[PDB]
A = this chain, B = another copy of it.
């Protein structure tokens, strides 16, 4: 007659960035419980070791199982091996994208629900060498490899778990608007389309094969998610 459901829980990493806020709004409209580890904003020190991140992540979800672990953290910096500042900017992109993803994988493995989702954020541009974006290309290339490697042994993920990486080309962010203010935005992906796709996968449906690198391709302002 009455059957009591259960709240779904998402561990959200990177909630403070443009895509992070769009993703938090989509989970909230979707009536998920959100644990925003990076919030209440800069809540976890970026100088954290991988071990310290996985401690802060385990601590934020104690006595919960998580149906999704969504990592959308990461900024962008340019630079070639010529610039002295490439060292500092690449260490930052490695910490925001790769350190966070390794820690997120361990919490997913130990606290994750059956049919759960781990979602990592790559970059379509990191499918090719990136001479002018050394740090960013190297960090996101590593995320892509980490996603394929996690997927390749399902015995250490929850049963019917999926790991996916999203590979955006260009996102329609305030930063992109002010950087390129007279460009055509017909290929810029809406943050809301990405966030709604992430919620749909997190609710269980339309997932490509675990380990997929899902390119986000926008043409004439319509988006497809392509493996």
Chain A residues in the interface with B (C-beta under 8 A): 49-51, 53-54, 80-84, 86-88, 90-91, 94, 98-99, 102-103, 105-106, 108-110, 126, 129-132, 134-135, 137-139, 141-142, 145-146, 148-153, 156-157, 211
Contacts and interface: CB of A to CB of B under 8 A. Distances in A.
B106 A132 contact: no
B109 A129 contact: no
Contacts of A110: 82
Interface class of chain A by DSSP: helix
Copies of this chain, whole number: 2
23 contacts: A53-B87, A80-B109, A81-B106, A81-B108, A81-B156, A82-B106, A82-B109, A82-B110, A87-B106, A91-B102, A98-B138, A102-B134, A105-B134, A129-B145, A129-B211, A130-B152, A131-B152, A131-B156, A132-B153, A134-B150, A138-B145, A141-B145, A142-B142
Nearest to A91: B50
Contact of A91 (B84, B86, B99, B151): B99
Contact of A156 (B53, B82, B94, B109): B82
A49 B82 contact: no
B153 A80 contact: yes
B134 A148 contact: no
A88 B126 CA distance: 26
Closest 10 CB pairs of A and B: A131-B153, A82-B156, A81-B105, A50-B87, A141-B145, A129-B152, A129-B148, A131-B152, A129-B149, A50-B91
Contacts of A211: 129
Determine which residue in A49, A54, A105, A106 has the highest number of CB atoms from chain B within 10 A of its CB, and name it. Answer: A106
